[PDB]
Symmetry: C3
Subunit: 158 residues, 3 copies
C-alpha cells in the first residue's frame, strides 16, 4: 500500500495539477490532495473554496481524496500516514525550493519519500499565478483550467 500526499496551495487548481493527479491515481492506492491554508500568500480563494474546487475536479477518481490543512506539512503527512510526498516539476520548476523543501522535510519526516512527476508537455506551462492574473483582466482561461474553476474565477472578479 502506497499512500501519497500531494501538498499545495492550489489557488486555484489547474489542468496542470489535474494531469498529475490523474497519473498519480493510476500509480498509487491512495492519493491525498492536501490543500494548505498558506495564509501568507493571501490566496484569492478561501481554503474551503480551494478544497471544494479540487474535489470537483477530482470527483471521478475513486482513490483520490481532498483535504485542507493549515499545520506543518511534516506533521500533517505523518498524521495522514502517507509514505510519499508528491510534487510536480515543469518549468524549472523552481527547482531550488523543491530540493530545499525535500531535504528539510526529510529531516522532519525521515520515513516519508519525496517523489516527483512531470505533467504532460501540453500542461507544463500552466501557472496558477498567471491563470489568476489573466482572469482578473477578463481573459479566457478555459484552456488552462477545469470548467468549474474557470467559472469560480469569472465570478470572483464579478
Amino acid at each position: 500500500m502506497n499512500r501519497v500526499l500531494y501538498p499545495g496551495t492550489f489557488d486555484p487548481i489547474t489542468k496542470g495539477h489535474g494531469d498529475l493527479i490523474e497519473r498519480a491515481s493510476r500509480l498509487f492506492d491512495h492519493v491525498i490532495i492536501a490543500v494548505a491554508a498558506s495564509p501568507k500568500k493571501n490566496p484569492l480563494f478561501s481554503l474551503e473554496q480551494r478544497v471544494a474546487l479540487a474535489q470537483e475536479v477530482t470527483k471521478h477518481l475513486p482513490n483520490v481524496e481532498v483535504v485542507g490543512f493549515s499545520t506543518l506539512l511534516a506533521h500533517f503527512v505523518k498524521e495522514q500516514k502517507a509514505n510519499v510526498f508528491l510534487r510536480g516539476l515543469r518549468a524549472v520548476s523552481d527547482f531550488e525550493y523543491e530540493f530545499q523543501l525535500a531535504n528539510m522535510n526529510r529531516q522532519l519526516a525521515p520515513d516519508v519519500e519525496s517523489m516527483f512527476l512531470t505533467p504532460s508537455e501540453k500542461y507544463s506551462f500552466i501557472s496558477s499565478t498567471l491563470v489568476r492574473e489573466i482572469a482578473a483582466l477578463g481573459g479566457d482561461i478555459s484552456k488552462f483550467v477545469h470548467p468549474a474553476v474557470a467559472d469560480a474565477l469569472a465570478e470572483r472578479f464579478k
Copy 2:
C-alpha cells in the same frame, strides 16, 4: 510589414531596455513600447511617469512609439495590430518565465510571434529592482540609467 510590441513594467526603463530598443528600432519598421500598469508590483513610478520616461529615452528613434496599458497583453497586442512580441534575454532571470509567458500567450494570441533579443554584455546585469533600492538608499545609479531616468530617481526620494 512588421509591428513589434515590447511589453514591460519599466520601473524605470534602464540602459538595458534602451540598448534593446536601439537594436530593435534598427531591425523593424515599427516598435511599440507597451508599458504595463502592473499594479501587483506596486511600481515606484506611476504608469504616466514610466511612460513619460520611456518617451524621453526613445524620442530620438522615429520608428519607436510608447504606450501605457493596463489591460490583458493578449488583448492589447491586437488593438495595437502588432504581429510580434519582443522580450529581452540575458541573465538569464528565469529563462522559463519567458518560455511560460510566451507559451500561454501563444494560446491567447495564436497569431503573434514571440521573439527574443539580447542586450550588450555591458548592460546585461542591470536590474530595475536593484536600481530602485540603490536609488532609495542614496547610492549613485547614473551608470545604470539614462540621465532623465537618473533625475526622476533622485527626485523620487526627495
Copy 3:
C-alpha cells in the same frame, strides 16, 4: 590584511550561515557579519535581535565581529574598510542574483572584490524563510540552527 564583509538579512542566522562563517574565519584576518535591516522584507526578528543572535553564534570566533546596518552596502563597506564581499553559494539559490549583485556593487565600490564560498553539503539546503515557517508551526528546527537561535524562535511564537 584582508577584511571581509558577509552581508545578509540573517532572519535568523542559520547553520548554513554559520558553516560559511567558520570557513571564513580560518581564511581571513578579520570577518564582519553585516546584518542588513532590510525593512522591505519585514523581518521576523528586529535588527537588534538578529545582530544579537549572530553575536551569540559567532562569539567563540575571535576574528569575527557582527555589525548591523541600514544604509547602502556599497557605502557601509567603506565605512567598515573591508576590501572583500562574502556571499554563499549553494545550488541555484538565486542564479546570478548574486552576479548582478556583484557587478552592480562593482560599479559602486570598485575597490572591493566579490568572493563566494559554498557551505558543507549538509548545510546547502537550509532556508531562513523555511526555518521561520517551520518554527511558526511548532516544528523542530534544531537541525537547522544554533540552540540559542532555536530558543529565540520558540519564544517568538508563544
